[PDB]
């Protein structure tokens, strides 16, 4: 898990999407300091094993001067960069031309644009179209469109209104994780259910990807669900990436999760009649929804401690 790293630059956003896992908005104040982020980026650029550095938010193009400065710190080290954005900056074709020129010159290998019925009140369809159309001039930047959907807001008209600008662009529609604004602003019956507490053989985490988050903590993946858990990899303010990687690889809970899957934790809760007490829902839109419900409090994580200690003694 030491070839990729991500930094969440800010919780601030121009949009206020009703599903947002971070409840991002123009008035969000959670963020690491700029100088601290410059130090993280410099360290990641100098690191010999990191190949990709990804930026997310919040909206990373909101303070473009700062994003460009960070990409310029990485440039002499030739690391690959990925960006994700709501594409608000697409409104002006001249701006789109400037940003694609910079992304091309700064080794940005992927740009993901999010557009759907939740983002639509904040960004015009023309802005998204301008970005997607201009991307054809930069075939080495992998362009994708992310569409967050619910049963009542499936983004069918959104895709039709993008017209031919989406031709050649990989589109993925995905359901909601019940975190952040999605917990209170979306009816739970409108969130698709694909998994249940019974299909335990398909309950496996897809893998870890280190994220240095805007709350100043470090998380083992970039799923919306993880940020409401108490699973953090930070032990001190000035912690190296070597130490973050070592902690991830020696975390007993994450080791058991990787090796045994969610059924190991779910069976303990079932045998001890803790499913209702810990508010574990019966159905979920994603395996991450199971993850988030198991570990979103210190009580829940600490409940598993004697079981994980017994697992360590029997297998190590």
């Amino acid at each position: 898990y030491n070839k990729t790293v991500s930094i969440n630059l800010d919780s601030r956003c121009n949009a206020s999407c009703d599903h947002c896992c971070f409840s991002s908005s123009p008035t969000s104040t959670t963020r690491m300091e700029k100088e601290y982020i410059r130090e993280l980026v410099t360290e990641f650029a100098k690191n010999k094993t990191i190949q990709v550095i990804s930026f997310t938010g919040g909206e990373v193009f909101l303070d473009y001067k700062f994003l460009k400065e960070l990409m310029e710190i990485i440039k002499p080290y030739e690391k690959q960069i990925t960006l994700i954005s709501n594409g608000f900056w697409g409104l002006s074709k001249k701006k789109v031309q400037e940003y694609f020129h910079d992304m091309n010159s700064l080794n940005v290998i992927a740009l993901t644009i999010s557009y759907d019925e939740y983002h639509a009140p904040f960004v015009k369809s023309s802005s998204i179209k301008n970005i997607l159309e201009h991307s054809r001039k930069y075939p080495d930047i992998d362009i994708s469109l992310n569409m967050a959907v619910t049963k009542d807001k499936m983004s069918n008209h959104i895709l039709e209104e993008l017209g031919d600008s989406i031709l050649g662009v990989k589109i993925t529609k995905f359901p909601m994780i019940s975190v952040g604004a999605a917990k209170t602003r979306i009816k739970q019956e409108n969130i698709h259910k694909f998994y249940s507490l019974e299909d335990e053989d398909s309950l496996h985490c897809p893998g870890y990807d280190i994220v240095y988050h805007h709350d100043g903590e470090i998380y083992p993946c970039a799923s919306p669900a993880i940020f409401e858990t108490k699973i953090t990899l930070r032990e001190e303010y000035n912690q190296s990436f070597e130490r973050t990687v070592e902690k991830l690889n020696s975390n007993l809970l994450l080791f058991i999760l990787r090796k045994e899957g969610f059924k190991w934790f779910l069976n303990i809760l079932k045998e001890n009649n803790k499913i209702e007490e810990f508010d574990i829902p019966y159905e979920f839109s994603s395996i991450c929804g199971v993850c988030g419900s198991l570990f979103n409090s210190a009580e829940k994580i600490n409940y598993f401690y004697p079981y994980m200690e017994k697992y360590y003694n029997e297998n190590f």
């Binding site: 997310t56 994700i84 993901t112 992310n146 995905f174 893998g207 993946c221 970039a222 919306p224 991450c288």
Partner: peptide, 9 residues
């Protein structure tokens, strides 16, 4: 979006 561990990236 492809695998959940890189969902917001």
């Amino acid at each position: 979006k492809s695998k959940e561990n890189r969902w917001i990236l």
